[PDB]
Amino acid sequence: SGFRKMAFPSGKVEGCMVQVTCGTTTLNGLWLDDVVYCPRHVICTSEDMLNPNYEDLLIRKSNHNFLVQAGNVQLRVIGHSMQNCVLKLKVDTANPKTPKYKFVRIQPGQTFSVLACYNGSPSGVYQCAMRPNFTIKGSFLNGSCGSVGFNIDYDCVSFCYMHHMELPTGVHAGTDLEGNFYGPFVDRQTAQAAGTDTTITVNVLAWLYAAVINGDRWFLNRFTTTLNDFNLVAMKYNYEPLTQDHVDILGPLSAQTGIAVLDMCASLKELLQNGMNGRTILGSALLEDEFTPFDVVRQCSGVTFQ
Amino acid sequence: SGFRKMAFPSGKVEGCMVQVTCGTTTLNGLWLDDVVYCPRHVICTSEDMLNPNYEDLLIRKSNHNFLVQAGNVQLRVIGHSMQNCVLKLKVDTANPKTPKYKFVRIQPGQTFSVLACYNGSPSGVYQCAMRPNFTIKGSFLNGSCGSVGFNIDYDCVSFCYMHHMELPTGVHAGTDLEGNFYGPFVDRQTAQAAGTDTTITVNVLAWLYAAVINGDRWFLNRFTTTLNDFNLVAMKYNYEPLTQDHVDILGPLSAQTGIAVLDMCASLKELLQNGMNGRTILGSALLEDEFTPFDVVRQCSGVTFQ
Ligand SMILES: N#Cc1ccccc1C[C@@H](N)C(=O)N[C@H](Cc1ccc(Cl)cc1Cl)C(=O)N[C@H](CC(=O)NCCCNc1nnc(N)[nH]1)Cc1ccc(F)cc1
Ligand SMILES: N#Cc1ccccc1C[C@@H](N)C(=O)N[C@H](Cc1ccc(Cl)cc1Cl)C(=O)N[C@H](CC(=O)NCCCNc1nnc(N)[nH]1)Cc1ccc(F)cc1
């Protein structure tokens, strides 16, 4: 029993974190085989950040301008290239701790574990969702940039996020590991605004199923809804539209609990219209949207507590 | 910016998790140097669990009855002993991945990271507090027993919890790594009840300071309280009494924010008496009590956002 925001075990990623320094700028990098990946704005000085021309900045650099430190050993940079907003530093030593890995670009609504790092040393691990507006609500301080987000599947690490900046509103923006930003953002020190965010409906439904699996049913009701009528309520409360694909993805949880997806939608509709009236679900007084259906299946029992 | 429940990086503990099997009972063990630590009820059959005499059960066992598996290698048990409710299996191989470590018995109100494991394989990491009634609100399924809780300080792992059982109410009970239960519990399969729980007042205050550091002040007020008058309100709302020791521990956070501890107590009093009126603090609609003052200092900026 129980239900917690649960990160993946971080050891396979810990062994890949390094420190990258150029001039007086230091941030984190990801060392896989003989390549170190890091945000390209490491090459900027504080004045370069306002409006940098990165190609003009990088051509003025040499391999030996980059200082890469893995624990207490320096790695010699023997080549460098830029791929979108990530810098790739070829080093003379392959990381002996390289896990099986993939780079993946995730969809909004998906979750991942963040290994927050400072000066190449891991400090903590927590779970994040990619918001519909392509920000994440992380916990990051100066020096965190280059920290990565990941999922793990049978000892393969799928890296999906590299941290690049905190926006003026205090939420966070970054790239896939091939250097493409999530969302409309660019890597320059300008005040950039995210689009208006929405609540991840399929995730709230997954979390309601988690609550039922764990033995709680107080929010259920005898009603059902059509998909169309549910989405009319969803729009009113700034929830993302629920698609038939979402309904299909919730199939297994519906089958395990015996609660049809559109019946759980009717529960959610009632919760949105009436509130919780002082009650909690899985210890929360708000409707939680940062658990995917996969996250629920991963953590909850495979048999519902009746 | 941001504030999340943040676990310690788990790699140093991952390399210590093994599987222990006796008869048809399999659970997790902790492999440090040439000793494997695990819950002693691994030696019980399903019938032994009702009321076991562990000394009588253990004297009937031989070293070779214990099967210890570390990944895909078997460790030979060359001795065994019982220390309170933990079994210590001496094996013929020292763990090459043993971190610097200590065993510590924590006080209620302290937090730790849990590495949830099944069949000796880590599955997830999350943060827990030891409740005032000496349970934890974990997330655990069958096979999790022997999973450990820990804190890390400058590459030293302080192990403080080993998981032994889920109570009828779905909360969790366990021991320190020397086998002494937290709370009044015993390791037998009987319905055991925890004492009535309370809210960890010093932790709620720490979390209010975290909110101020992150830039939010809406809950502050112009009032102050005496310690005695605050604790009269604390008792009404099932909060633990606040001691002068707690006030001292909050000293650094008070100094960083410029908010006296007894002034923050007056904010908390108003929040308890009036509720939040539809507002949130650090994204929560409830008052959070599973962040210690240390947890806040560890994660938040050292300079308040004014
Ligand atoms: N993670 C992180 C982090 C956090 C703090 C400091 C440093 C870092 C890592 C570091 N690498 C980082 O992100 N630096 C960026 C600057 C940067 C470097 C490089 C590139 Cl390519 C792009 C960028 Cl934008 C940075 O300084 N951003 C600040 C963070 C801030 O001041 N936050 C407090 C207010 C939160 N909002 C709030 N609080 N309360 C209310 N009600 N609202 C916001 C900003 C301000 C002007 C601006 F024009 C753009 C952005
Ligand atoms: N972690 C964990 C875990 C979770 C499930 C299964 C297995 C494990 C690990 C495994 N090692 C474990 O803990 N087994 C224990 C049995 C045990 C083994 C050895 C020793 Cl020394 C001591 C003990 Cl007690 C066990 O089966 N406990 C069940 C768990 C249960 O059935 N939970 C569903 C209800 C939650 N409550 C609720 N849900 N909804 C509402 N409103 N209330 C509770 C119980 C039931 C009778 C009883 F007499 C004592 C305790």
The sign of the CA dihedral B232, B233, B236, B240 is negative
Question: Cα separation of B209 and B202, whole Å?
Answer: 11
In DSSP terms, B24 is beta-bridged to none
Residue-by-residue DSSP string for A190-206: S---PPPP-B-HHHHHH
Class of the domain covering A15-99: mainly beta
Asked if A226 and A261 touch (Cβ cutoff 8 Å), the reply is: no
Q: Thinking of the domain A1-14+100-197, which architecture would CATH place it in?
A: Beta Barrel (2.40)
String of b and e for B244-274 (b: at least 16 CB within 10 Å)?
eebbebbeebbebbebebbbbbbbbbbbbee
Question: Cα separation of B219 and B279, whole Å?
Answer: 9
Amino acid type, A131: R
**Residues of A with CB below 8 A from B299's CB?**
124, 139
Helix-helix angle A227-236:A261-274, to 10 degrees: 30
Host H or E run for residue A162 = strand A156-166
What is the 3-state secondary structure of chain B? CCCCCCECCCHHHHCCEEEEEECCEEEEEEEECCEEEEEHHHHCCCCCCCCCCHHHHHCCCCHHHCEEEECCEEECEEEEEEECCEEEEEECCCCCCCCEEEECCCCCCCEEEEEEEECCEEEEEEEEECCCCCCECCCCCCCCCCCEEEEEECCEEEEEEEEEEECCCCCEEEECCCCCECCCCCCCCCCCCCCCCCECHHHHHHHHHHHHHCCCCCCCCCCCCCHHHHHHHHHHCCECCCCHHHHHHCHHHHHHHCCCHHHHHHHHHHHHHHCCCCCCECCECCCCCCCCHHHHHHHCCCCCCC
Residues present in chain A in total: 306
Nearest CA to ligand 1 atom 39: B215
Cα distances from A161 to residues A39, B75, B189, B234, B261, in angstroms, run 11, 38, 45, 43, 39
Amino acid type, B143: G
**Other Cβ atoms closer than 10 A to A264:** 26
Amino acid type, B63: N
Nearest CA to ligand 2 atom 18: B189
- B29: CA distance to ligand 2 center in Å? 19
**Other Cβ atoms closer than 10 A to B81:** 11
What is the 3-state secondary structure of A258-291? CCCHHHHHHHHHHHHHHCCCCCCECCECCCCCCC
Host H or E run for residue A115 = strand A111-118
Pairing label, strands A156-166, B148-153: unpaired
Host H or E run for residue A35 = strand A35-39
Environment class of residue B73 by beta-carbon count within 10 Å: exposed (0-12), middle (13-18) or buried (19+)? Answer: exposed
Question: Cα separation of A106 and A76, whole Å?
Answer: 32
Question: Cα separation of A187 and A173, whole Å?
Answer: 9
Asked if A211 and A203 touch (Cβ cutoff 8 Å), the reply is: no
Choose the mutation target among B28, B139, B150, B277 for the interface with A, i.e. most A CBs under 10 Å: B139
Q: Which of A29, A24, A51 is nearest to A40 (CA)?
A: A29
Residue of B nearest to A121 (CA): B9
Q: C-alpha angle with apex B190: B189 to B194, nearest 5 degrees? A: 115
Question: Cα separation of A282 and A209, whole Å?
Answer: 11
Q: What are phi and psi of A78, to 5 degrees?
A: -115, 0
* Range A198-301 has CATH code 3.30.450.20: no
Pairing label, strands A156-166, A100-103: parallel
Same fold flag, A15-99 and A198-301? no
Residue of B nearest to A165 (CA): B1
Q: How far is B64 from chain A (nearest CA, A)?
A: 31
Host H or E run for residue A166 = strand A156-166
Asked if A140 and B2 touch (Cβ cutoff 8 Å), the reply is: yes
Question: Cα separation of A150 and A100, whole Å?
Answer: 13
Q: Which of A161, A8, A153, A6 is nearest to B10 (CA)?
A: A8
Helix-helix angle A261-274:A201-213, to 10 degrees: 100
In Å, the largest CA–CA distance within chain A is: 69
Q: C-alpha angle with apex B292: B195 to B146, nearest 5 degrees? A: 60
**Structural resolution in Å:** 1.5
Host H or E run for residue A124 = strand A121-129
Query: Reduced to 3 states, what is the DSSP secondary structure of residue A2?
Result: coil
Phi-psi region of B119 (alpha: psi -120 to 50; beta: other; left: phi over 0): left
Asked if A117 and A111 touch (Cβ cutoff 8 Å), the reply is: no
Q: Where are the domains of chain B?
A: 1-14+100-197, 15-99, 198-301
Cα distances from B202 to residues B109, B205, B282, in angstroms, run 8, 5, 17
Q: Which residues contact B79 (CB under 8 A, 6 or more apart)?
A: B63, B89, B90
Helix-helix angle B261-274:B227-236, to 10 degrees: 30
Cα distances from A47 to residues A22, A25, B233, in angstroms, run 14, 12, 53
